[PDB]
Design a binder for this molecule. Structure first.
Ligand SMILES: *Cc1c(COP(=O)(O)O)cnc(C)c1O
Ligand SMILES: *Cc1c(COP(=O)(O)O)cnc(C)c1O
Lengths: 345, 360
């Protein structure tokens, strides 16, 4: 099929360096969860190191396994929790593994055998997702890791911000103050990370001792975290173009093989597509895997259609698609079917 | 990309699929049923559904593109397959080798295929545009010219099918007037879910085949408006399990933007499912089912995780039913449509391949 996502290696490389420049971070870990935010887990993970990425962050065990089976030897962090019965699997594949309880560590100590697990302690400061929420619980975990240094390596500690990209920083300040109170006077490991896209771009200077690592996704994928409210859109480069081609033309209406089942959601109805440097109106409704557009004149089968990207003097951006549909850029890209053809340009 | 080590799963029911196939055949009167398996079988799993299709009474598999048909063949499935969308003419010998009933929408396509097809007899399905269809011929002359080309070039082609796609009256009349007086092949199909359920006896000579998707996947076409919902069986249940449980005080914001704030001491569970799995942002606040009780999914749905308000403490690993039965309750696709604004077929198609699929 002609419907494809064309990922730009040079744009990813540009955004990585720009993120490090603004944040001051010397280490950048790219969030590649959910098929690399829809850009392609394997293709982005393959070119990541060449693009200046120091490590990869996945959400679940299987995304990390897929990266390893593809031959990629990069540093991998699992952001979310994993079932304790899989602790030996996480150790074998050398994953920095997120742990949320002392009970988890106790159960892991019994099954690791001769293996050593790289541990990342989750601290809950307000996201209310996973992690310890008291200084006692955090201290108990650190002590256990030191008591069983044969089975564990205390390598990371982190928290995640619920609103580091929000113009209203009240909750951010509450989380930041809670973070510093919790870690105060405790043994810190080699990786002390808290900076997501919003924190790296708007709050880096407010985070001393924890601003050397950028654990980011959104900004590196060329999307301004607040979408141009708190920072400049122009300084970031879009990392992909979504293209297709006409499969049928009738006397003028052209049909292209993309629909809601592919991620071109019903909410994108009437968002004009680009053909030969011209904006083209939609004809009818977006079907499951096909849709139609009004052509200015006759075009042959195989004529390129640009849905997201540049054509002539015009450009279809993720920002404009958000304003049109109500669907945030990261949600637009994640919704692109993992079945769609993906390539690196 | 399938998260096999994670609890989050789509449990497909073979018995329910078989029931819906039999029911669709009965109501429509169709003796042949072709299941539309486009877009990863409406999200239920292309290979998973295709493997059990014939055992469930399906007579053929309907795909949209060449790659989906090739995927089914490479999985070792020898079932009758038809491609409903157009393919690039250079791929005509590939379609013929795999014995696909191939959709053609132009005389020029046939002329180009006749030049490159050898001993291979391509099974041809003629698309007819009866209104605002995506593909197909729009005139009697163009249809007649295609039929005549196939009949005198029968060394490279086999005139096996003719069709149109419905939503009804203007289209039905136009269909009959276009095919009027012309030679009909063995497969004259027009009935999708809506036509099969509400208009079967209005389609004489073309009501022997049901080319359906929606209804066989257990969804009433009009969602109970024009037909009964209680006569169809849901084909799957979406389940997960708690990965973290905690008791948090009042004044605590949950997830991105702190859209939900606790009012008292509340037990909160974390689930390993998010919009990266196709559990869309607009599904926020849907009441999930845990141990026969309705539990509100609280806070913004993250990419891979979301939280739920629990009535009391539950251990890690406690089963959560998102779509399906639990106690006196049942979360249906209709319930999720009413809550989110997303139709049943659009809900299922949104499920990504990361969400593990199995047959029960
Ligand atoms: C998704 C995620 C990130 C990256 O967030 P962005 O806004 O995309 O930068 C960082 N840390 C954790 C724990 C995450 O889940
Ligand atoms: C999707 C499709 C169908 C099945 O439509 P349902 O309402 O889901 O039954 C039938 N024919 C064609 C050409 C299709 O694209």
């Amino acid at each position: 099929r002609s419907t494809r996502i064309e990922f730009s290696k040079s744009s990813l490389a540009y955004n990585v360096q720009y993120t490090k420049q603004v944040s001051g971070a010397k280490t950048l870990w790219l969030a590649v969860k959910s098929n690399a935010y829809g850009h392609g887990l394997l293709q982005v993970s393959k070119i990541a190191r060449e693009c200046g990425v120091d490590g990869l962050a996945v959400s679940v065990l299987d995304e990390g396994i897929a990266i390893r089976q593809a031959g990629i030897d990069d540093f991998i962090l699992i952001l979310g929790p994993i079932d304790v019965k899989y602790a030996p699997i996480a150790s074998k594949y050398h994953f920095l593994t997120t742990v949320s309880s002392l009970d988890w560590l106790k159960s892991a100590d019994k099954i690791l055998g001769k293996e050593k697990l790289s541990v990342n302690l989750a601290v809950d400061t307000g996201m209310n997702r996973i992690g310890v929420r008291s200084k006692k619980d955090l201290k108990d975990e650190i002590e256990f890791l030191q008591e069983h240094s044969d089975h564990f390596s205390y390598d990371g500690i982190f928290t995640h911000f619920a609103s580091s990209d929000n113009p209203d920083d009240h909750y951010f300040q509450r989380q930041k103050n809670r973070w510093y109170e919790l870690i105060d006077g405790l043994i810190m490991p080699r990786y002390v990370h808290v900076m997501n896209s919003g924190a790296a771009m708007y709050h880096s200077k407010e985070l001393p001792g924890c601003n050397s690592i950028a654990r980011v996704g959104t900004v590196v994928y060329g999307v301004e975290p607040s979408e141009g409210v708190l920072g400049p859109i122009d300084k970031l480069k879009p990392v992909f173009e979504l293209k297709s081609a006409l499969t049928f033309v009738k006397k003028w209406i052209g049909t292209l093989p993309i629909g809601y089942g592919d991620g071109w959601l019903a909410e994108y109805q009437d968002f004009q597509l680009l053909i030969d440097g011209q904006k083209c109106r939609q004809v009818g409704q977006i079907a499951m895997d096909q849709m139609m557009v009004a052509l200015p004149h006759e075009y042959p089968i195989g004529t390129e259609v640009t849905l997201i990207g540049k054509s002539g003097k015009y450009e279809n951006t993720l920002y404009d698609l958000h304003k049109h549909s109500g669907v945030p850029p990261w949600k637009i890209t994640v919704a692109f079917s993992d079945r769609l053809k993906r390539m690196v340009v």
